[PDB]
């Protein structure tokens, strides 16, 4: 399915997430790295992921952590 | 005991190489095992001849790498000092395994 040895995150996204959650939720964090995996320290937080032109905001619940950032941001728009 | 191996692309040229080697070996030594030939590395290529279209228009080429062994039995210092610095052939290379 993926690397067993370590679910992936981007390094800057990891450090941004830590400096956000330890200081408390105060601003929706905008980012580009769709390759990253959602972690349990992200639960309850608001992310703004790049879909190519803008950033779609996503809230992180319990079952987000089994999935990655890129699934919650469609970049192809079919009417 | 001295395994002499020759690789070339030209079978003619590698015969003049083997003839020189085996003749110098017979000249200053004894017990050659002849110019042993091995199956040629017959390496197959095909490419397209049109720059844009025509998948069915191709050209086919090959490399015929010719192999030879000699296998001198007595590694006497005399005959190996003669067989060195005297192979000097243009389009071959040499392996001298033990």
């Amino acid at each position: 399915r993926s690397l067993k040895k370590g679910p992936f995150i981007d390094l800057h996204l990891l450090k941004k997430v830590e400096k956000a959650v330890e200081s408390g939720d105060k601003k929706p964090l905008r980012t580009w790295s769709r390759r990253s995996t959602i972690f349990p320290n992200m639960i309850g937080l608001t992310i703004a992921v790049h879909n190519g032109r803008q950033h779609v905001p996503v809230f992180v619940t319990d079952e987000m952590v089994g999935h990655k950032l890129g699934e919650f941001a469609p970049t192809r728009t079919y009417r | 005991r001295i395994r002499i191996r020759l690789k070339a692309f030209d079978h003619r040229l590698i015969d003049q190489a083997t003839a020189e080697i085996v003749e110098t070996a017979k000249r200053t030594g004894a017990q050659v095992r002849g110019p042993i030939p091995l199956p040629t590395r017959k390496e197959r290529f095909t490419v397209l001849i049109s720059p844009h279209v025509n998948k069915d228009a191709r050209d086919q080429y090959e490399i015929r790498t010719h192999l030879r062994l000699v296998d001198i039995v007595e590694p006497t210092e005399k005959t190996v000092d003669a067989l060195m610095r005297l192979d000097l052939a243009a389009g071959v290379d040499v392996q001298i395994s033990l």
């Binding site: - | 005991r1 001295i2 590694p75 210092e77 190996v80 067989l83 060195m84 001298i96 395994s97 033990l98």
Partner: protein, 290 residues
């Protein structure tokens, strides 16, 4: 009938040192010994005490390894597996026959330590109980030293095989000859327990040859001329002797004299048991020409 076949257990008692009969006016002498059959042991008559001793020696080894309760599978089970992979460094491939040879090198070492082959069932039992109590664990040294000599063979093989130059190949041909002389089919029982350390010294000299070889052929060339001249002297001297004098032991140490000479040329950090020079090999050969 003392001379039989299919024998597996020393029920012979005091085995005859010699056999003698009389026919009319004159007597007939013989020497009875054991014979290895690769399945069992036999007893056959011989006409020379030395080859009688060799035959009884071989049959005693087979009888001993049959009477000991499974030292072969005991050492197969208890032997280190990294040591067994060191044995799997064998170019011949088979490891079971190598362990057979090393157990044989244990057996002759213990018989030499106990005082040689005896004719009696009491001496048989006295040696047999001790080779049971000690053979299962003295051969760990033989096994690990064969492991070390095979690591030496490994390193020298990885030097000889590959991209080779003819100025190198002059030395590598003689290194091949030394390799064939030292390591062969059952080399551990070929050389014996007394020479196993000396073979490791020989491979240390073989290792130490190559650093000088790769930097200067010419010094190596002259020293290999010296070794070559004493080697052809060895051949032309040992090939004119009587056939028993072509196979005796006192003529057999001169090859090891030449190898010690190789050590004294190429690796003097390791040393020889006694000072040796070409003059000393020649005074040896015209000393023992007879």
């Amino acid at each position: 009938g003392i001379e039989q076949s299919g024998l597996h257990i020393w029920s012979f008692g005091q085995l005859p040192e010699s056999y003698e009969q009389k026919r009319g006016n004159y007597k007939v002498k013989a020497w009875p010994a054991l014979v290895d059959e690769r399945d069992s042991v036999a007893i056959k008559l011989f006409d020379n005490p030395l080859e009688q001793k060799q035959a009884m020696w071989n049959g005693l080894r087979r009888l001993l390894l049959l009477n000991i309760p499974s030292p072969i599978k005991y050492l197969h089970e208890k032997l280190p597996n990294k040591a067994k992979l060191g044995l799997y460094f064998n170019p011949y491939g088979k490891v079971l026959e190598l362990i057979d040879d090393c157990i044989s090198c244990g057996v002759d070492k213990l018989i030499d330590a106990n005082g040689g082959p005896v004719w009696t069932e009491e001496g048989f039992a006295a040696l047999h109980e001790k080779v049971r109590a000690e053979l299962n664990d003295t051969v760990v040294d033989i096994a690990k030293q064969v492991e070390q000599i095979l690591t030496a063979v490994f390193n020298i093989n990885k030097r000889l095989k590959g991209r080779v130059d003819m100025t190198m190949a002059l030395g590598l041909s003689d290194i091949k000859a030394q390799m064939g002389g030292l390591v062969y089919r059952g080399f551990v029982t070929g050389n014996g327990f007394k020479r196993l350390g000396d073979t490791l010294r020989y491979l240390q000299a073989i290792e130490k040859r190559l650093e000088k070889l790769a930097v200067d052929p010419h010094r190596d060339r002259a020293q290999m001329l010296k070794v070559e001249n004493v080697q052809q002297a060895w051949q032309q001297w040992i090939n004119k002797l009587p056939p028993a004098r072509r196979e005796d032991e006192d003529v057999k140490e001169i090859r090891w004299m030449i190898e010690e000479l190789r050590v004294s040329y190429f690796a003097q950090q390791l040393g020889t048991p006694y000072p040796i020079s070409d003059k000393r090999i020649l005074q040896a050969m015209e000393q023992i020409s007879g």
